[PDB]
Amino acid sequence: GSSGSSGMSEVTRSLLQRWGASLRRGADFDSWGQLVEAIDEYQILARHLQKEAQAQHNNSEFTEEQKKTIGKIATCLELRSAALQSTQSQEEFKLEDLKKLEPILKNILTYNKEFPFDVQPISGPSSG
């Protein structure tokens, strides 16, 4: 096999951490006034979300129901980061809507789908 045992090896737990640590921070910047740094954080974190969502060999240390969200959470990010970059606008993603992923990420394993937002899962085999 590859995964090993169903559930969570242990490294996956370290992720949700470093991950949740990103968003948490990515926000800290916003509040203060570090959009630049913020974006980076979000993006970087977003990119990672994909690296796990899209995966390299459709592996993904996480299940399908998990990666789904992961691949989604990113989407939101793409909005947040952009929201920052965006100048002539003011109807994109907000913080609350962003921090709304803070828990999700953590409650990824215990995520019965039904995202509070309209964000499609980046990459992944659909239909079938």
Side-chain angles (χ1 to χ4, degrees), residues 12 14-15 21 27 29 33 53-54 59 64 66 71 81 83-84 86-87 95 99 103 114 119 122:
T12 287
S14 202
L15 252 194
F29 295 102
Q54 49 156 259
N59 264 306
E64 255 181 61
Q66 285 162 8
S81 286
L84 308 189
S86 100
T87 283
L95 251 172
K99 234 101 72 73
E114 225 158 286
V119 290
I122 264 124

Side-chain angles (χ1 to χ4, degrees), residues 90-103:
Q90 219 187 63
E91 224 178 78
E92 324 91 50
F93 226 68
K94 34 162 97 97
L95 251 172
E96 65 197 51
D97 285 11
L98 158 89
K99 234 101 72 73
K100 276 258 227 174
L101 313 168
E102 226 243 75

Side-chain angles (χ1 to χ4, degrees), residues 72-89:
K72 287 169 142 214
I73 297 180
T75 291
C76 293
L77 307 196
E78 312 229 305
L79 312 179
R80 186 91 199 85
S81 286
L84 308 189
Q85 288 146 90
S86 100
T87 283
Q88 260 103 45
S89 71

